[PDB]
Design a protein around this ligand. Sequence first.
Ligand SMILES: C[C@H](N[C@@H](CCc1ccccc1)C(=O)O)C(=O)N1CCC[C@H]1C(=O)O
Ligand SMILES: [Cl-]
Ligand SMILES: [Cl-]
Ligand SMILES: [Zn+2]
Length: 574
Amino acid sequence: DEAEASKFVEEYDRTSQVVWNEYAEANWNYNTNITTETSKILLQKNMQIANHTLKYGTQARKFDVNQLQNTTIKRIIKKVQDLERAALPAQELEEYNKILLDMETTYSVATVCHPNGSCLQLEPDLTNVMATSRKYEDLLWAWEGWRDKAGRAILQFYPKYVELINQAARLNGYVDAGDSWRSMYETPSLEQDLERLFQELQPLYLNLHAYVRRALHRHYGAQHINLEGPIPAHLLGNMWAQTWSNIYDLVVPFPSAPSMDTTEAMLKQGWTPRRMFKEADDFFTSLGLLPVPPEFWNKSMLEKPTDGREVVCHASAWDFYNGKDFRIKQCTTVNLEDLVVAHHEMGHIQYFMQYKDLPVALREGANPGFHEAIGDVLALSVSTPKHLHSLNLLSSDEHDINFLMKMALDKIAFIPFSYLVDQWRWRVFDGSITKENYNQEWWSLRLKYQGLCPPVPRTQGDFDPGAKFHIPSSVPYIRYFVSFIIQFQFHEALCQAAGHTGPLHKCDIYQSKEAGQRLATAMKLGFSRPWPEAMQLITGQPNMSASAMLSYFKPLLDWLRTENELHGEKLGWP
Ligand SMILES: C[C@H](N[C@@H](CCc1ccccc1)C(=O)O)C(=O)N1CCC[C@H]1C(=O)O
Ligand SMILES: [Cl-]
Ligand SMILES: [Cl-]
Ligand SMILES: [Zn+2]
């Protein structure tokens, strides 16, 4: 029957390309122009792609994968047997698709208004307030307001969403949706592996947390900061306190060594969103990697539209499954934070182009984390003082500690948050957390892992998780935790291949062909082989390891311990 198998995969591939390309079209139109019309069309297309999935998935299940000889065919067919949402009865499928659409629309058009009439959208208004305001009450207004308008509005849809996504998972052979999502890593030991990694980063996070807590105590006052407790969630310069880069000014280790206004420098010399992506595109090509197609610059939405249409601003990279059309949709703002995001997204695009010739079923990253790490790796080099100086955006061991601190505020602060999100969802999916306890358990984890507390007590009806994009958008989050760990492993390996010597944090792989080759060879595998092989190709070993990230920040860890020790900090919280 081996003959029927290769034939099946061939038909699945050519037909999937057509249907998936049409779907991406409708999805893009909705995402870049939210209207009743584009919404209705997208929902119609959902039913069409579902019909295709059910047709080929039903056939795939007729094959006994065990008796299949060719490992590539065996792998593709096993994957096609998973119908995902298409496994749901037609009635539940349309209800599920509408719920997803409603949650996405609700989140993307939510606004927080003042008594007068001035209403602010998340991007860039509220994001700017959280990043620049140093007034406790103004930060509270934005923090609470976003949750009141976005979070609370998602609550009416979540319980049903959970019921339906779990039903689909069970109909595909999994115990629940969390089980289904975790399966993407093909790693039985996943939960234990990630827990060990999280634990290895505790010394660093706890020391950074204590140091930043002391700084906030200095700025906002003893009456608002408990030196032995959690930090109010609205003072970290970010709506979700997932990255603390924006309060660098309040915590700079050596204020005597001033650093240029990077964001002001970009604006000062006319940097634009297009320039930002052009620079990222240049970094990739410098490594010998692929440049984005001409079509990319013509079809991407790199700026928030001003023609009246409403859009999903949250940045994302798109593969239209025809090996030629790739696009990015981002409401880009001119600043260093979004420059890094630009590289992040361009990393996804590079992966798309690298595996474009593989069967559609295998056009995915070695694991989701790999897809998320590519752009971040290059951004690590872009963020170095020397590289920023080469871009004319910047002009001592102290400058070194300041830099590591800036890097830690983003990378280290994000570790517990990235770990937390799916620890919460997996327990919602497995029934451990009911709708009565959604919010309470979210905050229990926010405290346990991040050491944060809500500035305003939560009340019945609040659903703070809904105020975070990936929740109503139903996008898994553990990939970001994996990404932050492995991106440093990649940085370390690529730097070693590039001939770098000395402190790892001083490495800049710009123009390194050796580094480019390692990334390309790995990306070309797509999802054709277990991820340890792609890991081996890049790093020379097959496991995930926190050693690289710890090595990168070693100088900061030493500095933080000394600093916290002399101030008598009590690490942690009750
Ligand atoms: C800006 C970026 N966007 C997402 C998009 C996710 C997504 C998947 C499927 C459909 C729409 C959006 C991405 O990974 O590119 C993002 O959300 N990131 C990057 C790092 C951490 C995470 C965050 O900001 O929470
Ligand atoms: Cl929150
Ligand atoms: Cl994931
Ligand atoms: Zn990403």
